[PDB]
Design a protein around this nucleic acid. Sequence first.
RNA 1: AGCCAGGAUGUUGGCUUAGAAGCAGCCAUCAUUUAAAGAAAGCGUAAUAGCUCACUGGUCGAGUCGGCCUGCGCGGAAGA
Lengths: 176, 141, 279, 38
Amino acid sequence: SRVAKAPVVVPAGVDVKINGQVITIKGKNGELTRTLNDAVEVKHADNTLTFGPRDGYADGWAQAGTARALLNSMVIGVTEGFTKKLQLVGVGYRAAVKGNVINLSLGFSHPVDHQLPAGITAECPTQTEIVLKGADKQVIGQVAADLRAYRRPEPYKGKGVRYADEVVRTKEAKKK
Amino acid sequence: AKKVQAYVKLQVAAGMANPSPPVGPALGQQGVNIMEFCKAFNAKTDSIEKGLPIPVVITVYADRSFTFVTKTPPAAVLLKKAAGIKSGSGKPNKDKVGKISRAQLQEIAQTKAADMTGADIEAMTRSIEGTARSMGLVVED
Amino acid sequence: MDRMGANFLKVVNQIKTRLGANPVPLQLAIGAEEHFTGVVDLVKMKAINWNDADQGVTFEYEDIPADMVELANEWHQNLIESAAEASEELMEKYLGGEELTEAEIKGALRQRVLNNEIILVTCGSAFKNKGVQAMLDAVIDYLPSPVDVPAINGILDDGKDTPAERHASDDEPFSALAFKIATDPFVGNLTFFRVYSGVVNSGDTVLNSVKAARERFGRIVQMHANKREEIKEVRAGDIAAAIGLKDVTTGDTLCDPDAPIILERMEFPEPVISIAVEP
Amino acid sequence: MKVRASVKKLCRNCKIVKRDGVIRVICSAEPKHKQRQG
RNA sequence: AGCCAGGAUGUUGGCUUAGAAGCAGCCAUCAUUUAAAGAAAGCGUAAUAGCUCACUGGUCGAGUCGGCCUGCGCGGAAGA
């Protein structure tokens, strides 16, 4: 397949701990482990990692096809990182980072300050731009999408919290 | 010459100084002073009797620059400049009015031969016969 | 200026982009818009305390606070620029280093209001009682008086053009103008007119010399914008109700005969939207 | 999500994936083109 | 199937020209170059600038694609 024609090359600076089904990757700034399913046959062969679908679970081409895409992201996420910037377009809406906490100037009668978990070093260059930094590809989206779900992109003004690369489709009033 | 940034050939009869804003967005693409394209071409526009759409192309550059290529008016409007009316295509294969022979077509092709490297003489001759049949025009020599 | 998104320095530096003017502001901002307590007057370099309760009480002036000791530095040096390029005489003491006091700089900038190249800006709150007591002292020093301006300039009645600056004092023929001419079910027609100079007594043959009509001057009444207070003797500069005008138009003169005469109606509008009322 | 018995691939870029078993059709820019049953 | 990737360019494609300027719609429906391009599919839109389909022109470097017939499966399926 395309995934079978896709092996991943681990570089120096990220150590694997192959206890069979449980792999804990000792990396640069974290520990990106995934306890996969038993539809995989893993082997860090020489340097480039090779994998395999186990018999019986012949649908493990899917279940390890996740894994081939997975561990490639893990060895490049623990070292380099993800810049996940969000664009705050709100009338009187600010963003400021302190410790691991983000403020949410969100047009309410009360402030919303939610604490953010490990795997996050957040920053804020201004009141409308907010950095998020992380090692797992999941955690760099999950903490980002929760903020965006508190104020979705409003398609009559362009109001809302929105990603850096995301482009909304704002409409027009057309009646009054 | 250039690539995916910008390349559109649109200019109509140069007696109108104003950029005619079904053409204006081709001047509204990469930040021109519209007075510059009015002052570029008028030094040579006083060598013509105006009335035909003359074409130019636009082509762009990095900072605020631009460029343009001057050619001669096309033979498609030269078919309907001599024929009197500017629009004859009402029924292509059901109208038989109006004759011009090949000799007129090549002398409006030498001004293409003295201007451009494509639109060659003998190859356009059937398409200057092809713009005649769609308009409902006849040709004999 | 007690609201979110209310940046003072943005808006005054937005005029230089959209309106294209030259504003140099004076009274700056102290406070993060909710704990806002000080308005930074920059000539005298003094912040003003405002009320906490008892809706209007204090006017307590102090120094520049320590949390804005450098933004007051970089903005005062642009204030004292604004007289070297207003008058040519302050050009050589911006660079020589003669002291640019509070009293010296306004003598140039007041003459920068008769040409109107700079406007004077002030941040504060009307409703939170933060700035209103501050805003009054600039009016006597940056807004022009009826005796400091070019006064009534009647030209003639007919013929050539000789524009004549008349006197702003009480020593002239009388002159006024007719505007804001409201109505009432007591006397009928009313006015909100303003006299520019001269004194009128009670009872006069005030004409309207642009449309050739004779009127007589009744019982003039002043207001608190609402309440009838009968103003008998109208001094030069009051605003009152030139009552009992038989016919009066937009902006004609209110003037005794054998005197200068205005004839001026500029920019007569056009009410555009037309709806048809039916009984 | 409008519901109707017919999921017809209607918009020009209409994805179809079987989430939970019930089909719901995924457009890009048109929210109006998204059905769910059938 | 994606990243580079030109969207080779005669033309204004008429009519009726107010814009119906490939992108409102009826008749033509040729093509100057054909290793890549149609007198044309939508969005941007009064018109177009923006973004593509067109051939994937160069890279990956193997399989892949749209329908016909049947074995069964899911949705359709809400009642006291």
